[PDB]
Amino acid sequence: KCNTATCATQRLANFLVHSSNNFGAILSSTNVGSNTY
């Protein structure tokens, strides 16, 4: 998981290179949905 740590670099970088995640995030709802449900 890694909430607040060096991992941030990996996660962010992944979201930067995978712009698609911006849209797919609504299909998976793992980063936007899981945040609550």
Side-chain angles (χ1 to χ4, degrees), residues 23-36:
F23 229 134
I26 301 98
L27 241 159
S28 245
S29 218
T30 182
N31 299 313
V32 57
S34 220
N35 204 68
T36 17

Side-chain angles (χ1 to χ4, degrees), residues 10-21:
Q10 240 65 57
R11 248 166 117 171
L12 226 57
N14 212 43
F15 156 71
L16 268 74
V17 54
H18 297 275
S19 287
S20 146
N21 277 129

